[PDB]
Amino acid sequence: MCLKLNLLDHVFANPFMNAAGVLCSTEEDLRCMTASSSGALVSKSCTSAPRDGNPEPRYMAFPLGSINSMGLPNLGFDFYLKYASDLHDYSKKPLFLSISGLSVEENVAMVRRLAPVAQEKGVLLELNLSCPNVPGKPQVAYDFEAMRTYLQQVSLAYGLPFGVKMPPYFDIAHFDTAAAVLNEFPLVKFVTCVNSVGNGLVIDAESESVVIKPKQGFGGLGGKYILPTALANVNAFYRRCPDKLVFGCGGVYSGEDAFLHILAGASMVQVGTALQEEGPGIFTRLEDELLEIMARKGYRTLEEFRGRVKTIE
Amino acid sequence: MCLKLNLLDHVFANPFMNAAGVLCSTEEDLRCMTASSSGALVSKSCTSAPRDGNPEPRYMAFPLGSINSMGLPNLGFDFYLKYASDLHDYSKKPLFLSISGLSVEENVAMVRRLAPVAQEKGVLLELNLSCPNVPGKPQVAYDFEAMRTYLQQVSLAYGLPFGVKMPPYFDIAHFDTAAAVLNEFPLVKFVTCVNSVGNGLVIDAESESVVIKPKQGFGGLGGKYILPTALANVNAFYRRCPDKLVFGCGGVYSGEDAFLHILAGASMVQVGTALQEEGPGIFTRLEDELLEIMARKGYRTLEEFRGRVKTIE
Ligand SMILES: Cc1cc2nc3c(=O)[nH]c(=O)nc-3n(C[C@H](O)[C@H](O)[C@H](O)COP(=O)(O)O)c2cc1C
Ligand SMILES: Cc1cc2nc3c(=O)[nH]c(=O)nc-3n(C[C@H](O)[C@H](O)[C@H](O)COP(=O)(O)O)c2cc1C
Ligand SMILES: COc1ccc(CCc2c(C(=O)O)[nH]c(=O)[nH]c2=O)cc1
Ligand SMILES: COc1ccc(CCc2c(C(=O)O)[nH]c(=O)[nH]c2=O)cc1
């Protein structure tokens, strides 16, 4: 029995990795993720310049999940590029680098300088589309024309296979449209579904107060709240993008949750809130739990059941 | 002491009611809701003609909530109109009738007939802006131009105060746009936030199968999964629509959950999944629980804390 995967011309011991933003902002964090049993890691979504991010408190967790309005705190592109170029031990596991420029021009500038390092070292790019553009407009992946522009410009500037991190959608017409935009771009080789469920609001009954400071308490939701939304999006893109990989993210706390992602279509499975809460030891637990489900079902490899969710009648 | 309130020129014993679609399809259901301790009831969204809805199983519930693709099964507008006109006992509690025509014309035809019954009996209209998916276009509330057309036509045809049932939004720009549309219409006197979170997917690990038969298992989510989503929409529209009431719906299982909805801005609080699971007994429990939280806090009225959620700095 085994959890090995071979994709994007890399080899992965198991499908598990951190979700961007969790345990991946500093060198310490990346060394930690590298030392863990995960099959890969992704760096914190970065901007050209370093950012402090939003005022604290800006992340909070609870039994059913988490809320965050971090504001993209990060060390800046040059730091992540350097980690990729000079510090990461690729003999341990593959590295993804996530970018989240605040304009199409900022993303283009970063990808242009990433490319030679991707070529030489094998770092894999995750472009975060679930991200601000012009304030008062919707996030980029909710504005199909902007999304198309970003992918056109990044495809031309980068010129190498990459993937994209997508917000969740809630309407079949959006699944259809979004997948059709993605399928215009042959360099988009993987699609990660999903980023947080946007602009939720957690309120504490005792204090009668919101629990995070930025945006009057509004922020993105992760964890147990979002599993069925995540599964829907993984399966929707799996069905609509037959020439691309889908990576699943959202609501993974157990090997069973990971199994469901994989049934839906996931290749890699990313862990955000649960990793933030439990720490990197979660990866040994998830591996063991997934293997136990596989042994009970008689599955020897992930490809035996990936995308094989049954429908009724 | 007691939870009675006055809204929309009617008196309510308490802020609780069923969510449209739950316990409200047949005369038996409407009589049961009427006999319960709820403050009001709403009928099943209807169409001009009866509908059988989608194949079964089309609803399933789990510890964290529910998934449904009911397909608008209903007895047809003539039935709900006759209930409103001849059968409902207005001395017991107010009645809302939910309409969900498949085109603007069908909604105009129903509301022209409802208007004199609204005038004579005081039945209240809830216009459901969600509908079965049609390839190539989004649900009406997710197409702002369509939404504006529907409200323009219904406002003209009906001519009396009414409300609208909204799906959730996830992006602040969308909140700004949707609220600007709604605020064009002075007869829209209440907004109900939210309908189910669209197109989630629940998978059963043992069977490796989706749990509902329609739409390859995709369906709207309710219950615990959607509480922070629901609160965010309630508060976003409460802030943006100061001349309207906001009715909260989503994730209410306890008087604490109802308390949070009211803190966010809810005037009435609707109960879907939890009502489907627990039955109409739930209303006495929610009343008791809400009054107990009020007493512990020193609140004597709902007005003392409605919309008064606190932000940080
Ligand atoms: C504190 C925090 C920071 C995040 N930062 C990023 C980020 O920089 N880039 C990104 O693509 N997603 C980011 N996300 C989203 C996660 O990658 C993930 O999509 C989301 O949390 C859902 O997965 P989960 O249910 O396992 O938490 C962040 C999430 C959290 C909780
Ligand atoms: C079985 C079922 C049928 C529903 N039918 C309708 C409907 O006819 N009209 C409507 O506006 N909402 C309908 N809904 C949505 C609910 O009114 C409510 O918005 C949603 O379930 C979220 O609330 P909850 O978390 O309390 O379940 C239905 C929900 C369920 C579970
Ligand atoms: C509302 O302010 C922001 C600013 C940047 C982003 C992109 C980074 C990001 C963040 C974040 O840094 O706040 N959190 C998430 O849950 N997902 C993300 O993709 C998301 C939201
Ligand atoms: C995308 O599929 C549908 C089908 C019917 C409707 C309208 C009725 C309705 C239903 C339903 O009858 O399936 N379920 C809900 O959760 N909310 C509703 O508003 C809304 C959406």
3-state secondary structure labels for all residues of A171-231:
CHHHHHHHHHHHHCCCCEEEEEECCCEEEEECEECCCCEECCCHHHHEEEEECHHHHHHHH
The verdict on whether residue B198 carries a ligand-binding annotation is no
Q: Which residues of A are annotated as a binding site for FMN?
A: 20, 44-45, 128, 165, 194, 223, 250-251, 272-273
Atom of ligand 1 nearest to the CA of A273: 27
Q: What is the resolution of this structure in A?
A: 1.6
**H or E stretch covering A95:** strand A95-99
| Rounded distance between C-alpha atoms, residue B148 and residue A220, angstroms | 28
Query: Kind of pairing, strands B65-68 and B59-62?
Result: antiparallel
Residues 30 through 69 of chain B touching chain A, CB cutoff 8 Å: 55, 57, 64, 67
Query: Tokens 């043992």 identify what position?
Result: B206
Q: Are B172 and A175 in contact (CB under 8 A)?
A: no
CB B202 within 8 A of CB B196: no
* B216 part of contact set with chain A, CB < 8 Å: yes
Q: How many CB atoms lie within 10 A of CB B16?
A: 27
The continuous run of DSSP H or E covering A168 comes out as none
CB–CB contact B202 A228 (8 Å): yes
Using a CB-CB distance cutoff of 8 angstroms, which residues of chain B are in contact with residue A256?
205
In total, the C-beta contacts within 8 angstroms joining chain A to chain B are 172
Among B137, B174, B193, B201, the residue to mutate for chain A (most A Cβ within 10 A): B201
Is A309 near chain B, with CB under 8 Å? yes
Residue B195 CA, ligand 2 centroid: distance in Å: 6
* Residue located via tokens 């060198």: A27
Solved using: X-ray
Q: Is B242 exposed, middle or buried (0-12, 13-18, 19+ CB in 10 A)?
A: exposed
How wide is the angle at C-alpha A232 spanned by C-alphas A231 and A236, nearest 5°? 120
Distance CA A172, CA A72 (A): 30
**All domains of chain B, ordered by start, with CATH?**
1-53+72-196+223-313 (3.20.20.70), 54-71+197-222 (2.30.26.10)
Is A74 an 8 Å CB contact of chain B?
no
Q: Using alpha carbons only, what angle is made at residue B118 by residues B5 and B150, rounded to the nearest 5 degrees?
A: 100
